[PDB]
Point group: D3
Chain length 151, copies 6
């Protein structure tokens, strides 16, 4: 079997604020498997592609500027319902609506600096994963705790 | 005052995944008192008795085999409303409906591998405590912080 | 921009139970700026002024006595919507109603020993700040991660 | 085959100060396997046998009373060189001589309240294990990470 | 007993890097009692008096400027051998000589940005305590865990 | 004036045991800057190159086999004295000789499963960085806390 995959990206503010280890640890503890990961400064064209569906938003140019202002940690996580559950772990788009215990709820304040990105549907995930990673960048291996995480 | 008690068991997957100390710490921090604790592999008959109310459910056989597949940490915790609060701390039966911050919300994914058990009512607690522990196994002592936790 | 501020006080039980560093860390991680902080045993008169609203309440004398029973860590934190968000972080007045992830949800059990105080509104905040701190005690400085927390 | 084993006991002060989960987590993270564990108030006679080699020391009577003053968490941990390594993890007998990073270096101050006990040699471990546990109390199972901890 | 006390200050870089709660937590966990605490930006004259014996050193002017560049958390901690032990917990003056497990070993890199200060002797401690605090700012209370930390 | 750089790789056992976030966090807290990072399963040929100096050692074939048995997190960290300090943080080659507080001292037991690699000299670091990364994979940005970590 092949389980669901989602695209998670730690934004420049998460890297600048030293929260990379803390964020990854939350996904590891939950039981998800890390499939791919790289560190890079994404180009504006790339980011425009990534946030294309928002190209007509007022905040769009500023968003792209900021996502290009520093490096990003791009990752692919695998697991049962990882897309929806990953979204629950992140919190709401606006940290102000996020609850303590969530990543945005514990670590940030403003929607313009909300430290992380997570695909909002399987459909987006597949598109984002293809945008940021070559197929040969996805590593398949089996977690030793697999049978202790799944029936 | 003779306070309320609940029965909590870390399931085989919690032990296998190295979460014993992490889970116990959550109860200590909260202010609850550890009354009893032992480590053992429960027999299938012992497990059917614990979950006797689920005997006619389709998943019953696989639940018993899973619970017998490794050791369990059985504990009794005491405190004001510990039954109901212990339940809130665990999260929902299905990790997918559990919120970040709860034990199942932070550490597991699937209902069949949901790392922990907590009595659901005082009636159930008293029954589970009697099934798992001999009266001489419950320890009575007073916490030094008692007056800082209770009025 | 001279942002919003709130008064947070770690009650005597929070100090006695060794939770000072743990609580402060939660505010620092979130991105709030520490503006003032002092450690003191507040007098009864000073405490009756602080909780002047609940003077007619039955628990009042008990509250004042416990608040005076040990030292308190008084602080002022600054940030966008810090008053409302600080309240979300603390949880409900009653630890029983506070969710895991919040300060009261993770660390305490009873309303009479609920480890921390946070202003409930901007107006209460301004009043409590004036009551607990002299103007020279509010320190002026900028956080190096300011631009990573705010747009 | 069967690896080395050591007896570890969290003293009454470790339980009272809420460090049970924290200490257990240190052994789990290291990769050691928990073999047995129970919570009890040890009798004075049992404690005199345990510390029989120190019966003529001036602190002996006080050591026995303090060890009997509250419950203890008795455990058996298994692993390659666990006796000697368990000792390095604990720190020196006197917390004053223990380095930060060790259990006593991090959590305590005085030799008379040094929170934990660990066997000092394979011979002692075998004697203490026999003194505190019945054969049926040592659980047999294999860790899922075993092949990731050992060649 | 009249327990020994030491002066600890978290330097401007510790505050800026969000390490205040983390540092305080280490002293609380160890069993030391917080006696006094305040947050302030010290004047250059105040800092020259504090570091008076280093007035002829090359780095002195740079040290006084850095220390005045942001606020400081000034604290007094109490405990058996707290002066010498607090020093052990800090690590070496040069973070590069500091071992993992110590505060400087874990959190910093360069001698000119070494996040914390601790008195180097009882004589110095008493002099620094007098310099930074007035008598009425040192709070006396007894920790509830006192008898579990000391014989 | 660019700073020293070192090559750090989390071995297959570190990934399998869910320690990726925990390890990265230790380097972030210390004040080092992440320059490059990728997740991959290294080929045997790549691994022989990496450990070419040990090719005639008895344990060499087994080393290469295990290093290829799972994915590796390859990273480049930058900072003052990062090569020697990264080494101190890792601990000794044999975990048995590693002190608590170090990565190997806290997380592993045997030399053949010692979770992490770190360049041992500046010369080794430059060779390893060239072997694992392309020049365009190294990201240059400045940390917002730079002036609080360095004079
Ligand atoms: N500056 C600013 N950016 C926003 C706003 N709403 C959305 N964004 C940002 O653009 C990202 C994409 O928006 P959206 O797809 O709705 O949110 P997400 O999928 O939860 O990240 C959000 O994470 C924020 O970084 C806004 O009102 N102001
Ligand atoms: N596979 C599986 N196991 C289930 C299901 N519902 C319950 N269980 C298991 O049964 C245990 C006991 O069920 P129950 O008493 O209803 O829930 P709990 O008290 O919340 O644990 C749960 O904790 C799960 O391990 C289900 O539909 N599927
Ligand atoms: N003993 C006791 N104290 C209470 C009760 N309700 C409130 N308090 C105390 O009074 C404090 C202030 O009350 P309130 O303004 O209602 O809540 P808060 O603003 O959330 O602290 C509470 O935090 C408690 O310490 C109660 O029913 N009993
Ligand atoms: N009060 C008191 N207890 C001591 C003293 N020396 C040793 N002990 C206690 O004796 C225990 C057993 O002593 P020992 O075998 O020498 O040390 P250990 O094997 O490192 O625990 C120590 O752990 C302390 O709890 C002392 O001087 N005073
Ligand atoms: N910039 C710089 N500061 C130094 C140097 N040596 C000492 N200092 C600073 O001077 C402070 C006090 O020095 P000292 O009293 O000798 O060390 P401490 O008591 O361990 O802090 C140290 O904590 C450093 O912040 C140095 O060589 N360069
Ligand atoms: N199985 C095994 N592997 C070893 C032994 N010594 C070294 N290694 C492995 O080889 C790697 C390379 O060794 P070396 O460069 O000497 O030490 P390092 O620089 O500290 O990693 C080590 O980190 C261990 O994984 C040994 O005796 N047995
Ligand atoms: Mg001995
Ligand atoms: Mg080598």
């Amino acid at each position: 079997a092949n389980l669901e995959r989602t695209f998670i990206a730690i934004k420049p503010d998460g890297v600048q604020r030293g929260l990379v280890g803390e964020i990854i640890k939350r996904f590891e503890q939950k039981g998800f498997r890390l499939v791919a990961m790289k560190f890079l400064r994404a180009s504006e064209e790339h980011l425009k592609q990534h946030y294309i569906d928002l190209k007509d938003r007022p905040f769009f140019p500023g968003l792209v500027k900021y996502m290009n202002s520093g490096p990003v940690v791009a990752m692919v996580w695998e697991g049962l319902n990882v897309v929806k559950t990953g979204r629950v772990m992140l919190g709401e788009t606006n940290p102000a609506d996020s609850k303590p215990g969530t990543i945005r709820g514990d670590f940030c304040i403003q929607v313009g600096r909300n430290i992380i990105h997570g695909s909002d549907s399987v459909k987006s995930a597949e598109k984002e994963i293809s945008l940021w990673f070559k197929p040969e960048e996805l590593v398949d291996y089996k977690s030793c705790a697999h049978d202790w995480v799944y029936e």
